[PDB]
Amino acid sequence: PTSCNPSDMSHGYVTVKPRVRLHFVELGSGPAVCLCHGFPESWYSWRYQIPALAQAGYRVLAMDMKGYGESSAPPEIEEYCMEVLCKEMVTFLDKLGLSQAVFIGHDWGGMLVWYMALFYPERVRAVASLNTPFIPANPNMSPLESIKANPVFDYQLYFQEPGVAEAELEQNLSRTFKSLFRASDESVLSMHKVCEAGGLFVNSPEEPSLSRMVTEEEIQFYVQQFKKSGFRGPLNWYRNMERNWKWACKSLGRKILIPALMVTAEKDFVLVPQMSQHMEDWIPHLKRGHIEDCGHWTQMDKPTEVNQILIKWLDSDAR
Amino acid sequence: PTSCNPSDMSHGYVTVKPRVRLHFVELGSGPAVCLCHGFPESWYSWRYQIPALAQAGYRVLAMDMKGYGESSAPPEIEEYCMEVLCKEMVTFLDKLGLSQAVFIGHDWGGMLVWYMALFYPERVRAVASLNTPFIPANPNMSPLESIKANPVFDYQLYFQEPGVAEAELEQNLSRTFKSLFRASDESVLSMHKVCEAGGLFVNSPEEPSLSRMVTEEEIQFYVQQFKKSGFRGPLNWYRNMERNWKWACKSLGRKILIPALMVTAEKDFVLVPQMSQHMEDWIPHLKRGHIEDCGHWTQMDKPTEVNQILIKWLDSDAR
Ligand SMILES: Fc1ccc(CCNCc2ccc(Oc3ccccc3)cc2)cc1
Ligand SMILES: Fc1ccc(CCNCc2ccc(Oc3ccccc3)cc2)cc1
């Protein structure tokens, strides 16, 4: 599928707060579709979707989320809680003069678009998440109790204290992204042996091989971007579990009423399909997509399939 | 009417050639409307139109034309001929993934959108010019002969040799813009005594008064921008008369077929309404607007009237 050359794009910048400006890439005409990547990614993670959606009749805005790439990376950890992040995206729409947009996210980005749909449905024409499900906040279950429940979520504990995961992730960026951006069958990480035996990459190859999903050129683009601000800002998306929990609790007792799409990935072994089992009771107008042989990095892994699911869903529920 | 605060806008950048990048301001959703200012202006000259068009259902892209503001200002004089300028605007659309846009221009910008309509009608949904008429090139009349015919066009002779007009225009920028941006009844310039008696401002007040059209704050914004690249780039739009003439001649014998609007200003004493007298024979689907009591700086002078004319015309001929 057609990808993007970064220098052949239109680049947009919007100031949402005094020292915070968001950067995005824009292509196409028609209804606005805002794409929100996950950790640790970039607008470039949507490179196979951007020209496909534009060609289908949509105006695509692919974000560099806060902390990433050309967007500002404020130092404070609380700048990366979901409450602040969502209101900045509302300001973003305001500054662009957009009454609403379609929101499509993946990973942390998918969590963000769910909460955009939940607290600002007025500004969200339609919402779609890849991998990330919407589970209502349990006001009786603290976040630490639920993380320290399912063992696959232990890498988030290693991500908590500032400076620790930054050091491992920044020490060699080419190794970091070549180790992460892999299909499920090529995976070199055990996300559970994380917090009692070194770190993320302690038992990974020092010079890992290049996944079938990516070229060397695409690895070096990610490498170049995370040389701008490093991994602190991206990691701070994990370091507000308790505030996100309290904020999410303030909405308990309301459903998401707008058109919605949930796309699950068979081989995403952390955000497993089954975690989405009962979103129908909270999201009455939910449509579904499901992709076989697809790991976590869904847009890179199965670009054709995701393109067909999104366009099919946009043409029937967003327009 | 609602204006714009510059820092509350979305700013876009597109690279159309190796050392040339165009800057624009963007607001709204709906059909694309590209606004192209004149000499010596800025995207800010459309400040009263941008929020009005967006509110009427249009996606506004207000350009900093080449040589101006935040857009690149290459040094070569030939970079500012109409042939190069128009193809860069085509590349601009390409990079944004826009099959076509509405083009609205004023002054030199209006000349540019006429030639966009003439050589690239496929990419122009509809075209509108304020003040600037479309007169077909006369292949028997050299440009110097026709300028040295009507005496009001003698300031263009003073603009020819590089460095001369730059010095007068840059010596005090606050004086330059306060002397230019005036209603017809407040005018301090005789554009004909230009080339045999000093220059543009030799018999103008050293500290001119502030026109009823503008505040001090708006003057200082123009002042701030023309501190970036100066007046050379803007002046170079006048220094390719013979190439524009030869290029325009290569199209003789064709009409402009697309929907079109010509807006004349009663008190524009250089681009007088009567210069547009016979554009109907070359532009069959031409609509007209006309604004009384309006000088050259049409968007600043009569903002309400221009807003009503454009929106009325867009809703019936562009959508
Ligand atoms: F190989 C890889 C590489 C990166 C990842 C990132 C996945 N993390 C996204 C995410 C989505 C929701 C989150 O909120 C919580 C928090 C606690 C419990 C349940 C949900 C926290 C993180 C996964 C595998
Ligand atoms: F007070 C002011 C301040 C600025 C201006 C600028 C007006 N100039 C725009 C323009 C439009 C077409 C042009 O092409 C020619 C060239 C020769 C003959 C006929 C048309 C040349 C310039 C006027 C009055």
Curated annotation (Swiss-Prot), chains A, B:
Cofactor(s), names only, from the UniProt record: Mg(2+)
Catalytic residues (UniProt): D107, Y238, H296
Positions carrying Phosphoserine: S142
A molecular function GO annotation: 10-hydroxy-9-(phosphonooxy)octadecanoate phosphatase activity
Mechanisms controlling activity: Inhibited by 1-(1-acetylpiperidin-4-yl)-3-(4-(trifl uoromethoxy)phenyl)urea (TPAU), 1-cyclohexyl-3-dodecylurea (CDU), 12-(3-adamantan-1-yl-ureido)-dodecanoic acid (AUDA), 1-((3S, 5S, 7S)-adamantan-1-yl)-3-(5-(2-(2-ethoxyethoxy) ethoxy)pentyl)urea (AEPU), N-adamantyl-N[']-cyclohexyl urea (ACU), 4-(((1S, 4S)-4-(3-((3S, 5S, 7S)-adamantan-1-yl) ureido)cyclohexyl)oxy)benzoic acid (c-AUCB), 4-(((1R, 4R)-4-(3-((3S, 5S, 7S)-adamantan-1-yl)ureido)cyclohexyl)oxy)benzoic acid (t-AUCB), 4-(((1R, 4R)-4-(3-(4(trifluoromethoxy)phenyl)ureido)cyclohexyl)oxy)benzoic acid (t-TAUCB) and to a lesser extent by 8-(3-((3S, 5S, 7S)-adamantan-1-yl)ureido) octanoic acid (AUOA).
EC number: 3.3.2.10, 3.1.3.76
Modification after translation: The N-terminus is blocked. The covalent modification of cysteine by 15-deoxy-Delta12,14-prostaglandin-J2 is autocatalytic and reversible. It may occur as an alternative to other cysteine modifications, such as S-nitrosylation and S-palmitoylation.
Domain called AB hydrolase-1: residue spans: 31-303
Enzyme class: hydrolase
GO CC annotations, alphabetized: cytosol; extracellular exosome; peroxisomal matrix; peroxisome
One GO term of the biological process aspect: regulation of cholesterol metabolic process
Annotated consequence of substituting E242G: No effect on phosphatase activity and epoxyde hydrolase activity
Transmembrane segments: none
Keyword check for Cytoplasm: yes
Subcellular location: Cytoplasm; Peroxisome
Modified residues (N6-succinyllysine): K193, K227
Chain residues carrying a lipid of type S-(15-deoxy-Delta12,14-prostaglandin J2-9-yl)cysteine: C294
Region feature Epoxide hydrolase, mapped onto this chain: 7-319
Keywords of the record: Acetylation, Aromatic hydrocarbons catabolism, Cytoplasm, Detoxification, Hydrolase, Lipid metabolism, Lipoprotein, Magnesium, Metal-binding, Multifunctional enzyme, Peroxisome, Phosphoprotein
UniProt-annotated binding residues for substrate: Y155
Subunit-level organization: Homodimer.
Note on domains (UniProt): The N-terminal domain has phosphatase activity. The C-terminal domain has epoxide hydrolase activity.
Family statement drawn from the similarity comment of this UniProt entry: Belongs to the AB hydrolase superfamily. Epoxide hydrolase family.
Biological role stated in the UniProt entry: Bifunctional enzyme. The C-terminal domain has epoxide hydrolase activity and acts on epoxides (alkene oxides, oxiranes) and arene oxides. Plays a role in xenobiotic metabolism by degrading potentially toxic epoxides. Also determines steady-state levels of physiological mediators. Bifunctional enzyme. The N-terminal domain has lipid phosphatase activity, with the highest activity towards threo-9,10-phosphonooxy-hydroxy-octadecanoic acid, followed by erythro-9,10-phosphonooxy-hydroxy-octadecanoic acid, 12-phosphonooxy-octadec-9Z-enoic acid and 12-phosphonooxy-octadec-9E-enoic acid. Has phosphatase activity toward lyso-glycerophospholipids with also some lower activity toward lysolipids of sphingolipid and isoprenoid phosphates.
Protein name: Bifunctional epoxide hydrolase 2
Native source species: Homo sapiens
Gene it is expressed from: EPHX2
